[PDB]
Symmetry: C3
Subunit: 258 residues, 3 copies
């Protein structure tokens, strides 16, 4: 495998583990990230995924050798390979779980895309972010809509057309990540606090809320509200909602937060 | 009512007034707010709305007594009453008036909802914002589209899926509110400043302008511009754009600014 | 002619030159800026455009001699000329070139609009921005969708409906421009730093990326990704890209960067 899975309680830790290449995205880790996501998709015991790069780097891009190797197969193999990386962005973005990305060192090209589809991104102040693609003659093609949705067209355009590079303090200022920490100790503390907040929140409740936020663009407003109101009733009447509102009234923690 | 109405000239102040429950939205209060908004919707003598909470809290969420009462009527009651709270947000968001929110203390759940549909929000630094909904097994269902519109998916996903509390200074940073003041004299000065800026501005112009902006979120650009051009022509030549452009070439205030 | 044009290698400078009306957008200027854009649209040797205003002023808005005289002509004249200014905004927004704006002095109404469609805006701390339209009884009708996209509904609704004015530093905090500097020597220096980052990026790659970016904001995700992935294979297969990947794997700069 190219990942290292450490399932603890309802938190699944996923480390990108090719430190030689700064955990660059080989073709297979795309396959292997997509299958883990697919494996936990319906699993409400899996409450949160934590995404980290091994050895001080999140992800420096798509793997050099594999992409070199790909020419032998031709441009139609680049399409469906590219699109399959697109599908990882869709499936990671739509993951019912809370996706925390812990980002240090290099966060470039497709590593940057991956950061764009997290619910929570925690950055090391000296991490370096960027979209090299066009200086290399090529396209941040699958990332494009996800960076727009991340930081807004105004910052995405500049970053993509000038290949500008920047640190975690700047990725924070640009609304690309939620937190920026000085060193490792403070990353983890930030990470553990984030996981304690998450523990307060119900997993079916989180999944449906998420789907609503994601859908809230598409998307005529009135119809979205009609449907949201149905989903709200369903949640109130289900096992999670009755426990959670009962817990509130009885001034206790709900089951999932014990 | 559950409200106190204060109409000073062109400014209708509206105070949520159930201080006992930190001004929780009751079924009655949503009804009254909707009735008031429809009352003035077509009235251009009413140029601004100020939305405020009695006793140092803005609004703490849905009223628990009413949520408790609805279980007796089942899923259909939860749906119909949640959707009507969605109708309040729609009709406040789309009000022809400038809607100013002065938010103090608790700004939670449906409370955080109303803040998200103001043209101008001014918060107390010690205000506490949050979406507790999924920490209770339910959904900020009607809120979802208005919060993603408010601050973007990237911030909304974190607030919603972690039930994070945070203060006024943070709410300014995240783009949730437009000003954060440290005390009540400051909060009030900002309010009256905003209101004097607003009185420069004509009411039919503001109204037309606010609809276009709201339509910009989802409207195909070409056809939106088409319509916008017709509206511009109808503004310049109406009995407001002519007074306005006149006051300008003359060296005086247009009448609405008197 | 209302414009000075100075090409140099890949960059084309365009200076708004009616310094006497604060370079106010006359009917003639609009037609001229449109023709330019159109001549260079398909020309990939023009890699960037730079917009600037003459005599320390960017653009104070719509020329008032031209706007007052248009009243002889009636509603349709205003409609047609307004829609024309929108088309300008459309055509600039969609320029396959990297569009840079340097912004000084007045940036009001119309001028505010051209800034909202640049890829990189660089502002003078002393620049004053604003949307005075409703204070004049009229609408920033064609601006409305571009500023919503620029800075988001939450900020655009307060600027437009209070005719609030703000400086270069504020315009940066609001995300309206990317860079702010205290003096022209610095505005200047930022421009060339910006242009150097760009020369690293290949012009066909940048045109295709910008198109993707522009089509994300509301263009269905799945279809978009399908097509982007086709495009990705072609960039990787073409002249740019094959050269870029090489120069990267090799020690050197690609040709467009030399």
């Amino acid at each position: 495998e190219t990942l290292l899975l450490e399932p603890i309680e309802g938190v699944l830790r996923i480390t990108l583990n090719r430190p030689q290449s700064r955990n660059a995205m080989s073709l297979a880790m795309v396959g292997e990230l997509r299958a883990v996501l697919a494996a936990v998709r319906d699993d409400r015991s899996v409450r949160a995924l934590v995404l980290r790069g091994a050895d001080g780097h999140f992800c420096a891009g798509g793997d050099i050798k594999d992409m070199a190797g790909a020419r032998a197969a031709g441009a139609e193999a680049y399409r469906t390979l590219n699109r399959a990386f697109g599908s990882l962005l869709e499936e990671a973005q739509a993951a019912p779980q809370l996706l925390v990305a812990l980002v240090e060192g290099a966060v470039l090209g497709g590593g940057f895309g991956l950061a764009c589809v997290s619910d929570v991104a925690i950055a090391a102040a000296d991490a370096q972010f960027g979209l090299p693609e066009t200086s290399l003659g090529i396209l941040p093609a699958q990332i494009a809509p996800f960076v727009v949705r991340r930081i807004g067209l105004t910052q995405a355009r500049r970053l993509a057309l000038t290949a500008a590079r920047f640190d975690g303090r700047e990725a924070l200022r640009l609304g690309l990540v939620h937190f920026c920490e000085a060193d490792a100790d403070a990353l983890e503390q930030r990470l553990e606090e984030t996981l304690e907040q998450l523990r307060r929140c119900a997993p079916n409740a989180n999944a449906a809320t998420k789907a609503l936020l994601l859908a809230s663009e598409s998307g005529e407003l009135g119809a979205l509200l009609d449907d949201a109101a149905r989903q709200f009733a369903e949640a109130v009447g289900g096992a999670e909602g009755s426990e959670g509102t009962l817990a509130f009234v009885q001034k206790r923690k709900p089951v999932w937060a014990q």
